């Protein structure tokens, strides 16, 4: 629906273990995180519409559409992301604590 | 949320070494404190303490307990005010 | 954007409310720069960012950053409303 | 930071107060403005709304609240600075 279990654009639960990609030699904490990703089809069910019916932005494009955006396609992408704290070694081996934006995909929607 | 703040690398990072940190967060999410430290044969050396955005690792923890047994740098996090003022190792 | 690759990038586009038909319900602003993303993904030229693309070299063009905007307008029942609308102004584009 | 005069003629249906101040919020980079809006069909002012208004280049560096459209049905002005929408006027400009 919006959360997945093979279907419409939805949010797939996914855990990235830094050990699985080699980054545990520079990241101290966390040892991984629920990054998630988006996947699925972007259908056209709602007449008078491209993608999100609520977005002003794509309603303006959608309107300017129906009279230089013919070539446009809709993917399943993140609509909401959330930051995460990380404690890691920078490239001079100083220990850094930072809040990294856009780490965790919280919601998916068709563009 | 408020947390104990400590920065062993204060000089280079140009912060204060110690104090508090008032945590800020978006709307629907939890706040946590963390601690981090070295333990070099029986002697604790503090690395950093402060606030910690929502992570599942910290959830319903009143206590700051080390996540790992023998790493070079230990990490804990906890939920609630000043829960990172003291901490502990694993068994 | 580039005369040589079709890279993913920000294209400018001003919206005039009087043009599209929307000035009878929208009091303010008269309009604004509602840009748009075009180009081809993935990017080969030029942090989920990196976990993705780094799982990708081994394993769409869309707004990566947006500004909100205030609007004064007539609602459906003919009342004047003021709302701060999120995601109105594309500042930056990138590949998902 | 920035405080603005607050007025809502539609306080009833939205559940707000009618009259006050509003304390402005906007993320780090950006400017914050105040605004007023009103009607005037026949000489008598009819307040609509006053409040905070997000970063908008039409408001940049205006210390007074001056509506500038020629002959609107609803007048709107925006400004920079604390309580800048306490007063408002109309100073039409070609357009």
3-state secondary structure chain B: CEEEEEECCHHHHCCCCEEEEECCCCCCCCEEEEEEEEEECCEEEEEEEEEEECCHHHCCCCCCECCCCCCCCEEEEEECCCCCCCCECCC
Measured in angstroms, the CA of A83 and the nearest CA of chain C are apart by 10
Q: CA angle, D21 as apex, D15 and D22 as ends, to 5°?
A: 70
- Computed on alpha carbons and rounded to an integer, the radius of gyration of chain A in Å comes to 19
Please, are residues D42 and D78 in contact by the beta-carbon 8 Å criterion?
no
Residue spans of beta strands (DSSP E) within C5-95: 9-11, 14-16, 26-28, 31-33, 36-38, 61-74, 80-95
Please, are residues C11 and C28 in contact by the beta-carbon 8 Å criterion?
no
With tokens 């990708």, the residue in question is C56
- CA–CA gap between residue B66 and residue B75 (Å, rounded): 5
Q: Which two tokens stand for residue D17?
A: 């107060």
Q: Could you report how far apart the first and last alpha carbons of chain D are, in Å?
A: 34
Q: Which residues of D37-65 are buried (b: 16+ CB within 10 A; e: fewer)?
A: bbbeeeeeeeebbbbbbbbbebbeebeeb
Do B75 and A85 lie within an 8 Å CB cutoff?
A: no
Q: Which domains does chain C have, with CATH numbers?
A: 1-96 (2.10.90.10)
B91: how many CB neighbours lie within 10 A of its CB? 4
Question: Which residues, at least 6 apart from A17, have a Cβ–Cβ distance to it below 8 Å?
Answer: A31, A32
Tell me which H or E stretch contains D66: strand D65-67
Do B29 and A95 lie within an 8 Å CB cutoff?
A: no
DSSP annotation of C76 reads: T
Please, are residues A67 and A31 in contact by the beta-carbon 8 Å criterion?
no
- CA–CA gap between residue C62 and residue C68 (Å, rounded): 16
- CA–CA gap between residue A11 and residue A109 (Å, rounded): 9
Q: Which domains does chain D have, with CATH numbers?
A: 1-95 (2.10.60.10)
Chain A contact present for B29, CB below 8 A: yes
Cβ within 8 Å of A, B 56-75: 56-57, 67, 71, 73, 75
Measured in angstroms, the CA of C37 and the nearest CA of chain A are apart by 10
* CA-to-CA dists, residue D48 to D34, D51, D65, D67, D92, angstroms: 14, 11, 15, 14, 19
Three-state SS at C81: strand
- CA–CA gap between residue C80 and residue B84 (Å, rounded): 50
CA nearest to B13 within chain A: A96
Q: Determination technique for this PDB entry?
A: X-ray
State the sign of the Cα–Cα–Cα–Cα dihedral D11, D16, D21, D26.
negative
Three-state SS at D16: coil
Cα C80 from chain centroid (whole Å): 26
- CA–CA gap between residue A71 and residue A53 (Å, rounded): 20
With tokens 């980079």, the residue in question is D29
Chain D contact present for C76, CB below 8 A: no
Do C72 and D10 lie within an 8 Å CB cutoff?
A: no
- CA–CA gap between residue B28 and residue C72 (Å, rounded): 28
Three-state SS at C7: strand
Q: Which residues of C43-53 are buried (b: 16+ CB within 10 A; e: fewer)?
A: eeeeebeebbe
B43: how many CB neighbours lie within 10 A of its CB? 7
Q: Which two tokens stand for residue D41?
A: 């069909």
Do C80 and D9 lie within an 8 Å CB cutoff?
A: yes
Q: Which residues of C touch A (CB under 8 A)?
A: 15, 20-21, 34, 36, 38, 47-49, 51-52, 54-55, 60, 62, 85, 87-88, 90, 96
A85, with CB counted inside 10 A (0-12, 13-18, 19+), is buried
Show the 3-state SS of chain A.
Answer: CCECCCCECEEECCEEECCCCCHHHCEEECCEEECCEEECECCCCCCCCCCCCCCHHHHHHHHHHCCCCCCCCCCEEEEEEEEEEEEEECCCCCEEEEEEEEEEEEEEEEC
- CA–CA gap between residue C9 and residue C70 (Å, rounded): 25
Q: Which two tokens stand for residue A23?
A: 């980054």
- CA–CA gap between residue A110 and residue A43 (Å, rounded): 9
- CA–CA gap between residue A58 and residue C87 (Å, rounded): 10
Query: Closest Cα partner for B5 from B65, B36, B51, B46?
Result: B51
C-alpha atoms less than 13 angstroms from C-alpha of A71 in its C-beta half-sphere: 8
Q: Do at least 3 CB pairs under 8 Å connect D with A?
A: no
| Dihedral Cα B44, B47, B51, B55, nearest 10 deg | -80
Q: Could you report how far apart the first and last alpha carbons of chain B are, in Å?
A: 29
Question: Which residues, at least 6 apart from D94, have a Cβ–Cβ distance to it below 8 Å?
Answer: D70
B touches which chains (3+ CB pairs under 8 A)? A
Residues of chain C with Cβ-Cβ distance to A74 below 8 Å are 60
DSSP bridge partners of A39: A10
Residues of chain D with Cβ-Cβ distance to C28 below 8 Å are 35, 37, 76
Residues of chain C with Cβ-Cβ distance to D35 below 8 Å are 28, 70, 72, 82
C-alpha atoms less than 13 angstroms from C-alpha of D40 in its C-beta half-sphere: 14
Q: Which two tokens stand for residue A82?
A: 């959330």
Phi and psi at D72, nearest 5°, equal: -70, 155
């Amino acid at each position: 629906g919006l959360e997945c279990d093979v279907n419409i654009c939805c949010k797939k639960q996914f855990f990235v273990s830094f050990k699985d990609i080699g980054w545990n030699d520079w990241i101290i904490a966390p040892s991984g995180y629920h990054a998630n990703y988006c996947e699925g089809e972007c259908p056209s069910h709602i007449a008078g519409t491209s993608g999100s019916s609520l977005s002003f932005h794509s309603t303006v494009i959608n309107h300017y559409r129906m009279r230089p955006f013919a070539n446009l396609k809709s993917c399943c992408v993140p609509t909401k992301l959330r930051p995460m704290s990380m404690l890691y070694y920078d490239d001079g081996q100083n220990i850094i604590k930072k809040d990294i934006q856009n780490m965790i995909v919280e919601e998916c929607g068709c563009s | 949320r408020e947390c104990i703040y400590y920065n062993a690398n204060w000089e280079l990072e140009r912060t204060n070494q110690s104090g508090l940190e008032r945590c800020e967060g978006e709307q629907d999410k939890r706040l946590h404190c963390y601690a981090s430290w070295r333990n070099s044969s029986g002697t604790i050396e503090l690395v950093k303490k402060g606030c910690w955005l929502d992570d599942f690792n910290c959830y319903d923890r009143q206590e700051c307990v080390a996540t790992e047994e023998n790493p070079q740098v230990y990490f804990c996090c906890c939920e609630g005010n000043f829960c990172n003022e003291r901490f502990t190792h694993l068994p």
